[PDB]
Amino acid sequence: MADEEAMLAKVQASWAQTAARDKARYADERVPEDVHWETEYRYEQSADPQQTLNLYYPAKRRNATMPTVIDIHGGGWFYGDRNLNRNYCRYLASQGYAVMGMGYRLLPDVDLRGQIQDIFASLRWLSHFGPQRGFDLDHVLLTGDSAGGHLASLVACIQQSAELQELFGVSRVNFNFTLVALVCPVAEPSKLPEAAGDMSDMAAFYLDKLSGGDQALVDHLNFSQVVKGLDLPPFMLIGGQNDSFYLQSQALLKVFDANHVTYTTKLWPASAGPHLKHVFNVQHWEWPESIETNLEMLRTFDALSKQQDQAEENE
Amino acid sequence: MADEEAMLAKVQASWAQTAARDKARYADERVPEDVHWETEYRYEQSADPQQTLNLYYPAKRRNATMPTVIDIHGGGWFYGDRNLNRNYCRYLASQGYAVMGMGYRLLPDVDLRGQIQDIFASLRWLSHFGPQRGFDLDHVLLTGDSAGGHLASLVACIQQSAELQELFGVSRVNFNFTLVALVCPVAEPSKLPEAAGDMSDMAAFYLDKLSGGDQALVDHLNFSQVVKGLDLPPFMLIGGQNDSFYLQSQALLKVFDANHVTYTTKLWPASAGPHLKHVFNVQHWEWPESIETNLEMLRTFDALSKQQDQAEENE
Amino acid sequence: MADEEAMLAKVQASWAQTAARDKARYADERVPEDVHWETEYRYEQSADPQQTLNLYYPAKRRNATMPTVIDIHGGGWFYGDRNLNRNYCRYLASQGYAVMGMGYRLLPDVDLRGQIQDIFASLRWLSHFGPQRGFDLDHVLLTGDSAGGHLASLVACIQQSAELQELFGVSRVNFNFTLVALVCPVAEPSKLPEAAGDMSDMAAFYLDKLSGGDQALVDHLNFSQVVKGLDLPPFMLIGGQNDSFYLQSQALLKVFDANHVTYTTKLWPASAGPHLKHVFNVQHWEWPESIETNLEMLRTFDALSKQQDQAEENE
Amino acid sequence: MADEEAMLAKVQASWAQTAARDKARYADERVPEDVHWETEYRYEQSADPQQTLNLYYPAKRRNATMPTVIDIHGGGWFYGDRNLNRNYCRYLASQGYAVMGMGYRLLPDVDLRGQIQDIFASLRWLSHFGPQRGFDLDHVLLTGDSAGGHLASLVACIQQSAELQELFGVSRVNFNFTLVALVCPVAEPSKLPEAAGDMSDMAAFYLDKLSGGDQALVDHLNFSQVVKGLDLPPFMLIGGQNDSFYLQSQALLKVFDANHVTYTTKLWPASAGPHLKHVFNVQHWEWPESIETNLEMLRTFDALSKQQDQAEENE
Numbered sequence A, B, C, D: 001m002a003d004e005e006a007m008l009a010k011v012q013a014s015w016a017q018t019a020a021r022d023k024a025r026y027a028d029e030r031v032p033e034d035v036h037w038e039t040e041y042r043y044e045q046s047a048d049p050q051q052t053l054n055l056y057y058p059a060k061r062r063n064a065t066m067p068t069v070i071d072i073h074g075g076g077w078f079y080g081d082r083n084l085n086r087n088y089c090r091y092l093a094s095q096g097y098a099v100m101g102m103g104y105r106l107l108p109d110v111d112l113r114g115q116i117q118d119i120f121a122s123l124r125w126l127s128h129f130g131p132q133r134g135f136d137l138d139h140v141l142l143t144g145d146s147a148g149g150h151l152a153s154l155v156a157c158i159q160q161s162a163e164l165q166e167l168f169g170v171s172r173v174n175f176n177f178t179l180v181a182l183v184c185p186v187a188e189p190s191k192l193p194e195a196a197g198d199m200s201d202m203a204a205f206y207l208d209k210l211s212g213g214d215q216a217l218v219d220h221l222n223f224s225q226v227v228k229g230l231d232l233p234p235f236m237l238i239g240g241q242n243d244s245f246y247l248q249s250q251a252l253l254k255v256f257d258a259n260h261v262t263y264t265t266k267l268w269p270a271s272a273g274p275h276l277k278h279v280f281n282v283q284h285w286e287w288p289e290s291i292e293t294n295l296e297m298l299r300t301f302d303a304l305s306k307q308q309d310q311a312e313e314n315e
């Protein structure tokens, strides 16, 4: 279609501009020290470069196994790879955590189901291979930023629900999430039209590529559609009033309240400054507010982990 | 206009040559060690990449707060960004100072007022957010090189004057400048025609883009026009007889004398060598003369700071 | 020939894609620490950049001489150079070994004989110059990956056989191989047609360029053709069921058994994961399975070396 | 001229190939550790990027001043800059020496006189500014490689001769050379036609551009033409039988013998290997033969320096 190939070309130009911004940022930014990484593991029998993951660890491990963080990167479902959030992942690992971050195939080559299947395959891989190399899968923090927060919010629900597992064509994995931390999530993509910005303007096209025309995906594209009826882990919602997607965070809180989700928040006020933009704590680990946000996340995780251990007579 | 687009194309080719020279220099130059930086903070609600700043600090801080240096880079008003003077800024930070350096929009997309507004917004940002992350704003060194020295000289006057604040559309910031150090400033751009070089030849075009046709800017483009009637901080004028803009420094001294400005100088004689070119102490921090110049600046600042503390019964 | 230049263009496009993958991997991968290298030694009187080698050593040597590892890189006979396996070579050196890795001219500019002559010239160079700079040539591990495993398997036979030396136009070198370790070798290239993949599909073209039309090369292209009648060193076969060339490893084992070759294996099962792809232990030294594989190789070498020293009344 | 612009284009293509080889080498080569450099000093009042120099020093200085090495790079008079020999210069500095290396304008934009004037201006600069930053100019080693060895051999003669100073339009500098070390020099360019290689084939064109049509330059292009009648420092001739310019070294020895020049040699035999190519000790500081060669040079220098100090009642 004329207009369709044009719409794709517009979306790809927006992400090419982002790409240049990301490259310029990483060329200058301080890198977290005292971390080791293992790169480019295939998580299935495929040569698709996106179906790969990275693992990150502190350079000196206190213990043979460390609590796990699993990161799902953002980029509007159309952009990104396992290296995009490398500095944020190194930061978390430097705090004493075993961290995994995966690639997933991008729209428009797959739809939302292909993305969810890729993520569940990376989790399944980790359930087989993680413990032997340092991952404690009894204590798992699942986190995602922006479109990655959308995906993380869906994965958290799918993991609890046999029906959603069938619809998305995945099996449950043999570990649970201790905490699910969403950073400026786009968890209600059907509301994208009522805000301003590039994604919101192009919204119907994003929604179409996410669903791939499958009405079952249309009916399960939003957290508010997959949350119903499930007993979920606790959530932590991170962001702020200077997030260009703040309306999404406001919408998500209402979904949380209506569904009796257990959550805490770290939402920065506008008064804390204009620099606390969309996903600032992921893009600039080194800023003081980013350190405060990220440590607050890890401390929430640790508190939930400790409670679980007391509960399981394993303190 | 035919000739106007041609004149712009000539100026941009000169700065593209400079750009290549700067890239080649930074690829080789020693980098100051033992410094941390925090990059790419937006200082207002904008995605304009120029409306961002960097912060620099010693890697090991003696104290929770350190005296402040705020750097305004040069580049003829048409060139540069927050990274241009990164090695010079790291050097100063390595001496035990909290340093901020800002981007500002470039001609011909803005005029002088837009540049001044950007600088005051970065200062305002720092007044809100700096102290919480290490900046002592009771002791502030404002410095600029070349066109950045012009801008610094204007900002120093505007900060003291309600009338100039109104004309430039800025509010005063809630800290003062302890010392204003100008390195090979172009503080009297209306005199650009009486010297030789690329900028001088293209002078009327520079002056036009600086004023943006606004006669109030034409009447306040030169330090000699904004200095009148104000009680100013002390100045330090750095440069030398091998500065291609030495005539500007000579002109500025006469303005200083006529207006009873408090100043000291560090002007290198021709006998100290041909390498002590325009802004040499900013471009090559590592040279012995650069270290001597830069430490002499920091020691002048420290002496003025100590006197202020004695005066304020806070030694 | 129309079709011939087309077939070459297809092979070169496949290797250009590999090349990009290799560059992306090396840009991110951790580098082994505590190693020194000496680069770009010519091993004959030639300015052909491929007729050069690198040497690698631990940064702090326990001893004046260290046991030797000699690495022959892969790349389908059409691709690669002395830098391709640099991280794998550094890893081995970091374990206390003096390592040499050579370039060799590539198809279609030479044929298999030119490749074998280049390798023997690098070995001859090392026999003249290695000991003076740290190589213990009484204990030598010869290793190759993929096409490099093919080449290593042939070199091991040629070194033992006056007749093959004459056919390949090389002289024996004045040291022996303690162990020959093949990593996912393509040691039976004539069987390439009975598997799937790029190389297998283009097989007849690979075989033609390897032989250069020389029927004596056609009759000695496969390990099974050069193994006959010789007393060989011990071999170690490394790979696994997720190697895209696993059928080659299966074929080689049958050749080993039929010819009473002394060997051990380190073949990973499919259950050990999809990431244990072709030559994974060479491409990602840092992974735990790679470390286990590579140390197991070095320990086999060390055990064979110790036995030799006991046998030679030199323990 | 048609043929002249063609000949220049051929020479520039040869040097562009060399340039790529040099870039590939520096991307991989180990860099000497524990050195500081100061870059891009202009040595005259010019913005010509070639009329600049670098200074190199050990990172921790034993003493306030260190013996001096001054390096003149090669590149056929048509190629190179102050960064070309940076690793070799760092190596020498790491041994406890203050090292200067200069750019000089390249053929065909200047002729030999312009090159000699640039070199003498860098020496004059150092005589004014070197001691204040660590250079001991009582003990000076002058070294050059290939075309840089030609230039060094001429500079050594010119410095001793009022007549050659007048012809080349330079003044003597206020220090002497303790030793002049030539590495694979092309000191008799008029003999270039009787060897093989790119430079030799294009020889008449090189000779024309060197002389710039000036018959006084034609009569003083060769060391054998400037050596006559002068009392010279001692020389050290470095190279070997695998230098593609070995015939030049053989020719120079005959000139040395005929003119009663004081010299020593470090000429490697062919038996020491094919890797000991033209200027190998400059291109690969890290090789054992390079370290041996370079330390032997520095020890010869030190011995000559000590003798001078005993002679001057200053031990």
Ligand SMILES: [Ca+2]
Residues within 6 Å of the ligand: A063, A064, A065, A066, A067, A136
């Ligand atoms: Ca544990």
Ligand SMILES: [Ca+2]
Residues within 6 Å of the ligand: B063, B064, B065, B066, B067, B136
């Ligand atoms: Ca303080």
Ligand SMILES: [Ca+2]
Residues within 6 Å of the ligand: C063, C064, C065, C066, C067, C136
């Ligand atoms: Ca030994």
Ligand SMILES: [Ca+2]
Residues within 6 Å of the ligand: D063, D064, D065, D066, D067, D136
């Ligand atoms: Ca001394």
Ligand SMILES: [Cl-]
Residues within 6 Å of the ligand: A035, A036, A037, C029, C030, C031
């Ligand atoms: Cl790492």
Ligand SMILES: [Cl-]
Residues within 6 Å of the ligand: A029, A030, A031, B035, B036, B037
């Ligand atoms: Cl940093």
Ligand SMILES: [Cl-]
Residues within 6 Å of the ligand: C035, C036, C037, D029, D030, D031
């Ligand atoms: Cl190294």
Ligand SMILES: [Cl-]
Residues within 6 Å of the ligand: B029, B030, B031, D035, D036, D037
């Ligand atoms: Cl340095």
